[PDB]
């Protein structure tokens, strides 16, 4: 059954006993509750692995994908229990890493998690990403362009669809790039850190990173945190401290790169 | 034309029967014709069937007369869905980016993609004067003080965001070159955390959402905008605007300073 | 002419929502125009305005008429009391309108209908310059009482709705009316600031008031001190000029600059 | 004279809303004046004021009278408890008034009714200069206890309503009353800041208090330190002078400058 | 004497509103004083205070007295639970009072009743200077546990109401009581900042606490670090001095300056102005 | 040992308010201690802690024990679900306590019970220095996954209550436990900033956690980067030292300074 969209009562014992999917507080063994800013989210990891295996097994993955877009959307959802995060203050996602879940991205053994590609509007993030020959590009919160006509570009509307689609394809062993996390930068607000960027963005990036790590996948996402010019280095350090990997691009070329690999953390750099 | 009147009574988000209703009826269940989106924290719905039906009646009519007679019916084209907390299942909702070589437009270049083209500049930039020199078919007037220009039959006055967007989408669908003077109320009304230049970053997301709803509907809208950036960060704010829409023209002294367009044959840059 | 409802109207009851704006619902009558200043919803009723302006013309004594009809004029401009009344009209402005047949003799012979603002800092002499333009009536709002208030031609008001109703009634009755001042609009319409630290909601409020005057074919004149930071005065004054039918900058009770949208185009002086 | 309602009044029930402001509704009695200081709604009842001031005059012993009548003075100035009581009166100020028949002997023989504020930073000696003007009573509000509070002529008050009721009663009873001080108004009336980091709502509050005093034909004198940033003190003092009937700047317990709205026009010194 | 209501009282029900402040209503008994610190409403009950302070004076074991009577002590200072309880008293301060009949031997022989604050930055030596003044008891609030908590005459407290009730009981029982410290008041009383960077609500809170002490004829001593920016320390310290009966500025566990409102006038030293 | 209620408890119903904190009311049982971090109310139950710590001691395999008892440990530290539960305890801290009978061998032989924080900026090597102190278990919280998470001696946690319950259970079971890190406390405990732009509520939260550990006679060690502005690092570190039982400043995975509240007085690296 589809996740409930009716708001679940937080004062009724019968409502609260139901699963997160069904508007209650009780997580099923397949459900992982997490948060991005004040937004609660659930990923159904077991439904995710099953849908990805079905996609891989299908006669035509492109046809299967179109035919099952609603089932896929149900993999990541906002649980609708009222005040659902009330029992889990300062909710992050359990940090995990395995030498048995590494990925060929920039280095042969990148840990599972999130790799962000950072730079301003003239950085050439999309150009550099296209040159890394990904299998699919998830297009989110960006203006429509000729690139969207490609079969390998998948358009999504909200955060839950973006995550459901990207996690599905990454689980199915596609190299997934998300263009972009613009709406996360714009939407995840609150107290700013010494760089001028909301600290809830760093916590959100670690939450998304650790959901990818738990699911043994790698997601690559473009992001422009729009730091003030005097604090760019601090903001970029805070982003690197939140995720499995980070590439800074300028003129569609790598300025710096840092990755948490199966054999240790590495750092590279080349001034523009 | 038979179009429903969207509900204005607030719909309950805790009652299963209310939530099961369509977006036009105060619930959460989108009909095949309904597209839910957001501009800032404002939820909106465009109804594709009300749009195609009413655009056909507009084509068959005299826009000024038609819009006066059908003012009540156009509320069905773009409306705020009145379900309580309607965006709760769709956090950070944008509009799916789309483009087609079969939906291109003759504006500045022969093959401008569907979307939004913004004309940018400060108070003395001459945005209105440059726009009038591009000889549009209709100018929608929104959020600006009354001027002699408002007496013209080709100027249609609107009051809120939903009326502005419904009139614009209907005219563009009916093949009119429509210009909006202006998006001042979007600059003033879409608030939140500021990025560079002191401009709310939610404005850039708002522009992308409007751009992509136009792209989905295969139309091009043109709009004047003054983002009121601080003087030291104008170039950065204008770059952020260009990164949000199908096209942007920077005007000064009612002349083009620079122009950038997403066309069917790639990105075009001038100036 | 009846009093608008002050009981809050339910936004979840269909019978309450179907009612007119004056009756606590959402349905505008043909005579009602819903608009907003900041987060404050307002309605002007064109029929209450025309009917009561005729009663004011018949009295030929504004000072006495306004004291006696304090209750009735609430029908002309009021806050509609439907809960969340602006929910169907996001980013609500007022339709821009102008006509060569609704022009006014103020500074130029053919000033468009709308709002003319007189701008300057504390000590600029806005009141003194205004008095020298020999208006017929001065509406006194949000200013400390002074000897000027004893004059029969000074009409005191308390809130925004009374100020606007009195102003629109006097202007419709063909009086040259000046409002001293829009201090409370500067102080009360706040939110995200643009340059100078002035709330951009103030510019939207001035355009909304301007366009209601334009729709009603009247001209209102108001003194305003936006209290911009000293480094951004020129920018704030340009933003104010971009919001209304006309603007006069005063210093030492003399014109520094003036810009007007007239029936024959934009006029700039100084 | 009866106690105002303290139960919150429903804003959605017609029977509750029809009640007077003292009874938790929205309908002002002829004796009630609704006004606001910041977001705080207030009512002054003219009949409770005139009745109780006559009782105070008859006692000829303010210190004793105020202790015995503490409960009754709640009727003079109170917060009306109707829910969302200011909803029909956005940006509510108080009608500016002046009369040559209500002038006062304070610094000049014909000071208009209103509020006179005494300004100065720390160590200015606002209290020392004020005590040298030989007031009849000093109301003590929001200040730490001092040997001065032992004096029979010092009357301690706790909140804004008690301070205003005691002040209006004493002034109506023809006492020269000084308020030490408006510190809690500076601290409590918050919002968007103007120059100097001073909330512009403070200027509107001072004009509202000034105009209530002017309507009631009394003069109140109050010490205030708006705590402006050092670079903008002159601008903040200009904004205060523009908000009230009179203002004195003190240093070393001496007058540095003074400006008053008098029955014969504005008077300026230094 | 009994613990106050913790059930929230209705503000729309006439019967609930008619009840005393301790019983969840709005009607102050003659023994109740309503005041506020920031947005926190508080009530001190003079009868619970006088009754329990007399019991503390008579106690053969004061340390056990505080633990044994912890439930009754909630009656002395409490948050009244009427909904929107401050609605009829906007900008509520506490009536300023002073008496030559209620003076105290602290730094000077005739300190007025009120609050004396000891001010200084992190590492100023406020605790060390206070301990050198040989107080009878130290209330420990919002500070990390230290050897002091086991070795000296001290009483550990958890929240603002317990801190104030314990302080008022000890001072009424004629103890020289010091509070280490008011850091949770500095951290918790927020809002619009003064030209100093410090919330002006902190100054109003200090005057409210000062005047409750003055009304009850007691003197409380408290350490405070307002955490002013370095360029505005002098302004913040002046605003604090203008809010209370006395203030001592300490640096390197020594008096830098002191100002006190005494029964015979202001007594001060080391002042830069 | 039963699960605390997650249904929100009424604050206007006398029967609901009379219930224990675990059961959604306001009445603390003799075993319950109510405290707060920021606006977050918390309860530690001393009987759930001693009962489950005894079960953990008996298992002698923390990783396996924590997987099997994940539901039970919710009784040790939980958010009480009574509505407005902190309403009778404004500015709630935790009673400061110390005892010569509850000292710990950490850096010095007699460190008082409480919290010891390890501070340093990005690249300071806090985790590396901590690992070199050979702790028995490292709790991993609010940090990106790393090769270190593969170790059996690393236990991953998700929220503040799980982090504190796991830490208190391990310390009560006589494990030297280190927490990597308090990054989510730095991000999550917001409000008015003091010097360096650090929220002063962070200092109060560190004292509350310190004093809960002191009351329970345990020592917890945690890494923290308070992310002060560069000009006020020294002041922020002094404010942190003033809030807890001990603090170590690390740079290049080496001690630059250390201060500890010991059973025999304050110990400083300045000596």
GROMACS .gro file of N, CA and C in nm, chain A residues 10-13 16 25 82-83 86-100 111 191-194 199 202-203 206 209-210 213 231 237-238 240-244 260-265, chain F residues 6-9 37 40-42 70 74 79 81 122 140-150 156-162 180 183-191 196-197 199 225 227-230:
model
  294
   10UNK      N    1  -0.095   1.243   1.672
   10UNK     CA    2   0.013   1.212   1.766
   10UNK      C    3  -0.043   1.189   1.908
   11UNK      N    4  -0.176   1.199   1.927
   11UNK     CA    5  -0.236   1.188   2.060
   11UNK      C    6  -0.328   1.067   2.072
   12UNK      N    7  -0.343   0.992   1.962
   12UNK     CA    8  -0.427   0.873   1.956
   12UNK      C    9  -0.336   0.750   1.953
   13UNK      N   10  -0.347   0.663   2.055
   13UNK     CA   11  -0.261   0.543   2.067
   13UNK      C   12  -0.266   0.452   1.942
   16UNK      N   13  -0.069   0.620   1.651
   16UNK     CA   14   0.075   0.623   1.676
   16UNK      C   15   0.140   0.482   1.661
   25UNK      N   16   0.415   0.602   1.428
   25UNK     CA   17   0.555   0.624   1.471
   25UNK      C   18   0.640   0.498   1.468
   82UNK      N   19   0.189   1.332   1.279
   82UNK     CA   20   0.214   1.465   1.333
   82UNK      C   21   0.338   1.464   1.424
   83UNK      N   22   0.430   1.566   1.410
   83UNK     CA   23   0.546   1.574   1.501
   83UNK      C   24   0.623   1.444   1.506
   86UNK      N   25   0.959   1.381   1.710
   86UNK     CA   26   0.957   1.415   1.852
   86UNK      C   27   1.038   1.322   1.945
   87UNK      N   28   1.054   1.193   1.908
   87UNK     CA   29   1.124   1.098   1.995
   87UNK      C   30   1.272   1.085   1.956
   88UNK      N   31   1.312   1.153   1.848
   88UNK     CA   32   1.448   1.143   1.791
   88UNK      C   33   1.506   1.282   1.768
   89UNK      N   34   1.546   1.350   1.876
   89UNK     CA   35   1.605   1.484   1.861
   89UNK      C   36   1.743   1.472   1.802
   90UNK      N   37   1.781   1.571   1.722
   90UNK     CA   38   1.914   1.579   1.658
   90UNK      C   39   1.942   1.450   1.580
   91UNK      N   40   1.842   1.409   1.502
   91UNK     CA   41   1.849   1.283   1.427
   91UNK      C   42   1.941   1.293   1.309
   92UNK      N   43   2.047   1.214   1.314
   92UNK     CA   44   2.139   1.198   1.201
   92UNK      C   45   2.114   1.054   1.148
   93UNK      N   46   2.207   0.998   1.071
   93UNK     CA   47   2.197   0.862   1.016
   93UNK      C   48   2.324   0.789   1.058
   94UNK      N   49   2.308   0.666   1.104
   94UNK     CA   50   2.421   0.584   1.155
   94UNK      C   51   2.537   0.583   1.056
   95UNK      N   52   2.659   0.625   1.095
   95UNK     CA   53   2.772   0.618   1.000
   95UNK      C   54   2.812   0.472   0.976
   96UNK      N   55   2.829   0.434   0.847
   96UNK     CA   56   2.872   0.297   0.813
   96UNK      C   57   2.968   0.304   0.695
   97UNK      N   58   3.055   0.206   0.684
   97UNK     CA   59   3.148   0.195   0.571
   97UNK      C   60   3.188   0.051   0.561
   98UNK      N   61   3.210   0.004   0.439
   98UNK     CA   62   3.254  -0.133   0.415
   98UNK      C   63   3.348  -0.137   0.298
   99UNK      N   64   3.455  -0.216   0.312
   99UNK     CA   65   3.550  -0.237   0.204
   99UNK      C   66   3.482  -0.319   0.093
  100UNK      N   67   3.368  -0.382   0.124
  100UNK     CA   68   3.290  -0.465   0.031
  100UNK      C   69   3.186  -0.382  -0.047
  111UNK      N   70   3.445   0.519  -0.112
  111UNK     CA   71   3.345   0.459  -0.023
  111UNK      C   72   3.202   0.493  -0.069
  191UNK      N   73   2.014   2.877   1.134
  191UNK     CA   74   2.137   2.936   1.189
  191UNK      C   75   2.255   2.911   1.097
  192UNK      N   76   2.328   3.017   1.065
  192UNK     CA   77   2.441   3.008   0.976
  192UNK      C   78   2.568   2.980   1.051
  193UNK      N   79   2.658   2.909   0.985
  193UNK     CA   80   2.791   2.882   1.039
  193UNK      C   81   2.885   2.996   1.007
  194UNK      N   82   3.016   2.986   1.049
  194UNK     CA   83   3.109   3.100   1.031
  194UNK      C   84   3.135   3.136   0.884
  199UNK      N   85   2.404   2.577   0.884
  199UNK     CA   86   2.466   2.453   0.932
  199UNK      C   87   2.374   2.336   0.910
  202UNK      N   88   2.488   2.128   0.616
  202UNK     CA   89   2.594   2.028   0.641
  202UNK      C   90   2.538   1.902   0.705
  203UNK      N   91   2.449   1.919   0.803
  203UNK     CA   92   2.387   1.803   0.868
  203UNK      C   93   2.305   1.725   0.764
  206UNK      N   94   2.536   1.518   0.549
  206UNK     CA   95   2.583   1.397   0.620
  206UNK      C   96   2.471   1.295   0.628
  209UNK      N   97   2.445   1.144   0.284
  209UNK     CA   98   2.566   1.063   0.267
  209UNK      C   99   2.551   0.925   0.336
  210UNK      N  100   2.508   0.928   0.464
  210UNK     CA  101   2.504   0.806   0.542
  210UNK      C  102   2.389   0.714   0.498
  213UNK      N  103   2.556   0.542   0.217
  213UNK     CA  104   2.651   0.444   0.272
  213UNK      C  105   2.579   0.318   0.325
  231UNK      N  106   3.443   3.372   0.272
  231UNK     CA  107   3.438   3.250   0.353
  231UNK      C  108   3.424   3.122   0.271
  237UNK      N  109   3.545   2.350   0.320
  237UNK     CA  110   3.595   2.259   0.423
  237UNK      C  111   3.480   2.193   0.498
  238UNK      N  112   3.376   2.270   0.532
  238UNK     CA  113   3.262   2.215   0.605
  238UNK      C  114   3.187   2.114   0.520
  240UNK      N  115   3.327   1.929   0.271
  240UNK     CA  116   3.414   1.811   0.264
  240UNK      C  117   3.403   1.727   0.393
  241UNK      N  118   3.384   1.794   0.508
  241UNK     CA  119   3.376   1.726   0.637
  241UNK      C  120   3.244   1.652   0.655
  242UNK      N  121   3.149   1.670   0.562
  242UNK     CA  122   3.015   1.612   0.576
  242UNK      C  123   2.991   1.493   0.488
  243UNK      N  124   3.075   1.470   0.387
  243UNK     CA  125   3.041   1.370   0.287
  243UNK      C  126   3.159   1.280   0.252
  244UNK      N  127   3.130   1.175   0.174
  244UNK     CA  128   3.234   1.080   0.131
  244UNK      C  129   3.333   1.139   0.032
  260UNK      N  130   3.704   0.994   0.058
  260UNK     CA  131   3.717   0.891   0.161
  260UNK      C  132   3.715   0.762   0.085
  261UNK      N  133   3.832   0.697   0.072
  261UNK     CA  134   3.841   0.573  -0.003
  261UNK      C  135   3.857   0.454   0.092
  262UNK      N  136   3.847   0.334   0.038
  262UNK     CA  137   3.866   0.213   0.118
  262UNK      C  138   4.005   0.202   0.177
  263UNK      N  139   4.103   0.276   0.120
  263UNK     CA  140   4.242   0.272   0.168
  263UNK      C  141   4.286   0.404   0.236
  264UNK      N  142   4.190   0.488   0.273
  264UNK     CA  143   4.219   0.614   0.339
  264UNK      C  144   4.169   0.737   0.266
  265UNK      N  145   4.174   0.851   0.334
  265UNK     CA  146   4.126   0.979   0.283
  265UNK      C  147   4.235   1.042   0.202
 1362UNK      N  148   0.520   0.711   2.341
 1362UNK     CA  149   0.554   0.805   2.234
 1362UNK      C  150   0.428   0.887   2.198
 1363UNK      N  151   0.309   0.843   2.245
 1363UNK     CA  152   0.188   0.924   2.230
 1363UNK      C  153   0.208   1.053   2.310
 1364UNK      N  154   0.173   1.168   2.251
 1364UNK     CA  155   0.186   1.297   2.323
 1364UNK      C  156   0.084   1.304   2.437
 1365UNK      N  157   0.131   1.342   2.555
 1365UNK     CA  158   0.049   1.349   2.677
 1365UNK      C  159  -0.017   1.486   2.690
 1393UNK      N  160   1.853   1.983   2.683
 1393UNK     CA  161   1.965   2.034   2.600
 1393UNK      C  162   1.900   2.122   2.495
 1396UNK      N  163   1.526   2.087   2.400
 1396UNK     CA  164   1.493   1.944   2.399
 1396UNK      C  165   1.484   1.890   2.541
 1397UNK      N  166   1.366   1.843   2.585
 1397UNK     CA  167   1.360   1.782   2.718
 1397UNK      C  168   1.410   1.639   2.712
 1398UNK      N  169   1.477   1.594   2.819
 1398UNK     CA  170   1.527   1.457   2.825
 1398UNK      C  171   1.506   1.402   2.962
 1426UNK      N  172   1.826  -0.294   2.125
 1426UNK     CA  173   1.801  -0.161   2.071
 1426UNK      C  174   1.667  -0.099   2.122
 1430UNK      N  175   1.575   0.244   2.478
 1430UNK     CA  176   1.493   0.364   2.472
 1430UNK      C  177   1.446   0.403   2.613
 1435UNK      N  178   1.303   1.128   2.523
 1435UNK     CA  179   1.233   1.257   2.528
 1435UNK      C  180   1.093   1.229   2.595
 1437UNK      N  181   0.713   1.268   2.657
 1437UNK     CA  182   0.619   1.321   2.557
 1437UNK      C  183   0.500   1.400   2.612
 1478UNK      N  184   3.906   2.194   1.187
 1478UNK     CA  185   3.917   2.098   1.078
 1478UNK      C  186   4.064   2.066   1.059
 1496UNK      N  187   2.990   0.641   1.722
 1496UNK     CA  188   3.000   0.723   1.601
 1496UNK      C  189   2.864   0.788   1.575
 1497UNK      N  190   2.862   0.922   1.572
 1497UNK     CA  191   2.737   0.997   1.562
 1497UNK      C  192   2.755   1.123   1.479
 1498UNK      N  193   2.667   1.144   1.383
 1498UNK     CA  194   2.659   1.270   1.308
 1498UNK      C  195   2.778   1.302   1.220
 1499UNK      N  196   2.853   1.200   1.185
 1499UNK     CA  197   2.976   1.208   1.103
 1499UNK      C  198   2.960   1.124   0.977
 1500UNK      N  199   3.026   1.159   0.864
 1500UNK     CA  200   3.014   1.074   0.745
 1500UNK      C  201   3.085   0.939   0.767
 1501UNK      N  202   3.028   0.833   0.711
 1501UNK     CA  203   3.088   0.699   0.718
 1501UNK      C  204   3.233   0.697   0.672
 1502UNK      N  205   3.316   0.621   0.745
 1502UNK     CA  206   3.460   0.614   0.718
 1502UNK      C  207   3.509   0.471   0.740
 1503UNK      N  208   3.632   0.439   0.695
 1503UNK     CA  209   3.685   0.301   0.711
 1503UNK      C  210   3.680   0.256   0.859
 1504UNK      N  211   3.703   0.350   0.951
 1504UNK     CA  212   3.695   0.328   1.096
 1504UNK      C  213   3.560   0.261   1.139
 1505UNK      N  214   3.449   0.289   1.066
 1505UNK     CA  215   3.319   0.231   1.100
 1505UNK      C  216   3.313   0.080   1.079
 1506UNK      N  217   3.410   0.023   1.008
 1506UNK     CA  218   3.415  -0.123   0.991
 1506UNK      C  219   3.460  -0.195   1.119
 1512UNK      N  220   2.770   0.259   1.585
 1512UNK     CA  221   2.705   0.373   1.520
 1512UNK      C  222   2.571   0.403   1.586
 1513UNK      N  223   2.539   0.533   1.603
 1513UNK     CA  224   2.407   0.573   1.660
 1513UNK      C  225   2.346   0.680   1.571
 1514UNK      N  226   2.216   0.701   1.584
 1514UNK     CA  227   2.147   0.796   1.496
 1514UNK      C  228   2.106   0.930   1.565
 1515UNK      N  229   2.036   0.925   1.680
 1515UNK     CA  230   1.988   1.049   1.740
 1515UNK      C  231   2.058   1.076   1.875
 1516UNK      N  232   2.026   1.192   1.935
 1516UNK     CA  233   2.085   1.229   2.063
 1516UNK      C  234   2.050   1.127   2.176
 1517UNK      N  235   1.924   1.078   2.181
 1517UNK     CA  236   1.889   0.988   2.294
 1517UNK      C  237   1.963   0.855   2.281
 1518UNK      N  238   1.975   0.800   2.160
 1518UNK     CA  239   2.047   0.674   2.141
 1518UNK      C  240   2.194   0.697   2.175
 1536UNK      N  241   3.254   1.018   1.886
 1536UNK     CA  242   3.299   1.086   1.764
 1536UNK      C  243   3.175   1.109   1.676
 1539UNK      N  244   2.933   1.693   1.679
 1539UNK     CA  245   2.901   1.778   1.564
 1539UNK      C  246   2.747   1.810   1.556
 1540UNK      N  247   2.656   1.711   1.576
 1540UNK     CA  248   2.512   1.742   1.569
 1540UNK      C  249   2.463   1.828   1.686
 1541UNK      N  250   2.536   1.829   1.797
 1541UNK     CA  251   2.500   1.917   1.906
 1541UNK      C  252   2.537   2.060   1.866
 1542UNK      N  253   2.656   2.076   1.804
 1542UNK     CA  254   2.700   2.208   1.757
 1542UNK      C  255   2.600   2.261   1.652
 1543UNK      N  256   2.559   2.174   1.557
 1543UNK     CA  257   2.464   2.217   1.454
 1543UNK      C  258   2.324   2.242   1.508
 1544UNK      N  259   2.280   2.157   1.598
 1544UNK     CA  260   2.141   2.150   1.644
 1544UNK      C  261   2.099   2.237   1.759
 1545UNK      N  262   2.193   2.274   1.846
 1545UNK     CA  263   2.161   2.355   1.964
 1545UNK      C  264   2.187   2.499   1.924
 1546UNK      N  265   2.081   2.567   1.883
 1546UNK     CA  266   2.087   2.702   1.828
 1546UNK      C  267   2.029   2.808   1.921
 1547UNK      N  268   2.043   2.931   1.880
 1547UNK     CA  269   1.989   3.042   1.956
 1547UNK      C  270   2.087   3.156   1.955
 1552UNK      N  271   3.236   3.471   1.890
 1552UNK     CA  272   3.273   3.373   1.791
 1552UNK      C  273   3.157   3.326   1.707
 1553UNK      N  274   3.036   3.376   1.737
 1553UNK     CA  275   2.917   3.334   1.666
 1553UNK      C  276   2.869   3.198   1.716
 1555UNK      N  277   2.644   2.967   1.958
 1555UNK     CA  278   2.522   2.981   2.037
 1555UNK      C  279   2.556   2.953   2.184
 1581UNK      N  280   3.396   2.031   1.758
 1581UNK     CA  281   3.451   2.146   1.685
 1581UNK      C  282   3.341   2.251   1.692
 1583UNK      N  283   3.315   2.548   1.589
 1583UNK     CA  284   3.311   2.629   1.466
 1583UNK      C  285   3.297   2.778   1.495
 1584UNK      N  286   3.381   2.824   1.583
 1584UNK     CA  287   3.392   2.962   1.617
 1584UNK      C  288   3.447   3.041   1.499
 1585UNK      N  289   3.418   3.174   1.491
 1585UNK     CA  290   3.490   3.257   1.395
 1585UNK      C  291   3.639   3.257   1.437
 1586UNK      N  292   3.731   3.276   1.340
 1586UNK     CA  293   3.875   3.266   1.363
 1586UNK      C  294   3.931   3.361   1.469
   0.00000   0.00000   0.00000
